[PDB]
Design a protein around this ligand. Structure first.
Ligand SMILES: CCN(C(=O)c1ccccc1OC)c1cc2c(cc1N1CCNC[C@H]1C)n(C)c(=O)n2C
Length: 116
């Protein structure tokens, strides 16, 4: 399977499935819409690039993820943003740790498929 020959549609089908699997791990509904700046007024004082699963879905369908690195980078922002903004004694921090853990095998297996 050679990179210049790779078709977009199959790759996007793979990313759609992978994103569904990742988002399903958000059983607390913490990561599935943007952190609202109106309700968390200091959020952008700390976080340079917010990310969430709905924004990832929009990016996917707008053809913004054309390799696995860029996709995984945004999933990793969901986690890292949360670990920075929230203290390690909070439920939200631990929820990000759990999301990273559960996302791990999903992403590794998905990348292996993307590399054929
Ligand atoms: C701003 C929403 N939020 C809350 O914790 C919250 C605040 C006020 C009133 C109700 C609320 O939720 C019930 C929130 C903050 C987050 C946050 C997520 C949320 N909410 C929790 C409720 N579901 C939506 C989600 C965006 N993440 C990932 C963060 O890093 N921070 C700081």
């Amino acid at each position: 399977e050679i990179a210049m020959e790779m078709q977009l549609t199959p790759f996007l089908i793979l990313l759609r499935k992978t994103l569904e699997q990742l988002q399903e791990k958000d059983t607390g509904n913490i990561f599935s819409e943007p952190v609202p700046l109106s309700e968390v007024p200091d959020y952008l004082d700390h976080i340079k690039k917010p990310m969430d699963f709905f924004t990832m879905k929009q990016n996917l369908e707008a053809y913004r993820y054309l390799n696995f690195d860029d996709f995984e980078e945004d999933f990793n922002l969901i986690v890292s943003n949360c670990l920075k903004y929230n203290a390690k004694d909070t439920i939200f921090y631990r929820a990000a740790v759990r999301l990273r853990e559960q996302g791990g095998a999903v992403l590794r297996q998905a990348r292996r498929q993307a590399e054929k």
